[PDB]
Symmetry: C3
Subunit: 173 residues, 3 copies
């Protein structure tokens, strides 16, 4: 949990979603069904809206924010890796945001995309569907393989099940 | 909030500052007027002092620490981007520390400087005023433009207003 | 603290260890004597076990997780730097994981190793003993010097003392 409203705007969280009590969700944030927000993950909807599509996960120590005129939209089946940071960007469906990677303002990530760990997607950068992105500044290095494409969805499914495990079996001690 | 003292040393926080209750401020830490510390941001003043100049922001999931003999001094109008990490360094005025970047021990960042997202400033590295720094190890790639210089201050001003919004309108639900 | 069990599995924490109340320890996690987990550090043992050897520290805003079939084992005298991320990897003794670095699944870090800040150790990557690793993807650039080797242990010792300071002198205010 650790949900807050700011100036009237309240987060809209679907009942099936899992928001760790150590995560922080503030203001204009929408979490669709079967989404999950993990420990120390922060979704600060105090400027533009932060929309998180169904079956998507926002892992441990992630930050999601926006800039004026630059809302953040996360698609379906999106995996936002541990310690990653998404800032005022649009992310398509079946996208794996690598651990500790960074997606900046105005960027547009296509569907079925994998952003490598530690990669930095520059402002306004557009990433085509089925791409593997690496480096700083991140560049499309090649297209995803059949295996990787399957994974762009399975990674998210694994988290949907994991989220449910926590909702039913977590206990503070 | 989530403020703690350690062995007698208590943080000195100006009344106008905003410290998110999910942030963690420990020991020898000084926060001047109109400063702001956001969710999961950690300022651990358990070794050397951590000084944060007025109008500066320490964003979500940032860590600020020190090494023996290496205190951390943040200037005025400094923006420490989401998930960044400052360790025993001296940062001048009107500096934007990029998202997920790293500033190491002994480094000295001049005034009106922009450190790119994911950049790593090596130990004892000195950055001249009006510089744009990119890479790992971070290097001065060019001087800031008129627009960027204006931004080195406006970024901080935006946060001063944002901080006030939170102080007056945040509500746990 | 902020310790939780999940589906029966409870963390096993030695009495001498220090777990900041703002850190998050979940499930199958073992913390040996004189270990320390700092603010916003997250050890999610909800898949494979996370084992932390004695005298090791998991610094501020770190995340430690695993993948199915890929448990995370941290050796003795290991320093996991601020904002770093270890995912389903095996780390030897006297290893310094650089600030904001990333160690991926299947990797095996030898003993007396230093991973540079912001470095990314690729999946299944094996790092020889006494190595300095830099870059993305991280590569062994040279062997450690006498000074650095001494440091691979002293860094951890400093934290053992620091941990004790917190256990005895921390006070919420
Ligand atoms: Zn932001
Ligand atoms: Zn430190
Ligand atoms: Zn994971």
């Amino acid at each position: 949990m650790a949900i807050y409203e700011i100036n009237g705007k309240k987060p809209r969280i679907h009942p099936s979603a899992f928001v760790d009590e150590n995560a922080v969700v503030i203001g204009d944030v929408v979490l669709e069904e079967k989404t999950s927000v993990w420990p120390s993950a922060v979704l600060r909807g105090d400027i533009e809206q932060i929309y998180v599509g169904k079956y998507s996960n926002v892992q441990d120590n992630v930050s999601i924010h926006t800039s004026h005129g630059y809302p953040t939209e996360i698609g379906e089946y999106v995996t936002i890796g541990h310690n990653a940071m998404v800032h005022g960007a649009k992310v398509g469906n079946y996208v794996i945001i690598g651990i500790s990677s960074v997606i900046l303002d105005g960027a547009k990530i296509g569907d079925h995309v994998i952003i490598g760990a530690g990669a930095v997607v520059p402002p306004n950068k557009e990433i085509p569907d089925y791409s593997l992105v690496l480096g700083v500044p991140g560049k499309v290095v090649r297209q995803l393989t059949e295996e990787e494409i399957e994974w762009t969805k399975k990674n998210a499914e694994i988290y949907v099940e994991l989220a449910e495990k926590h909702i039913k079996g977590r206990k503070r001690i």
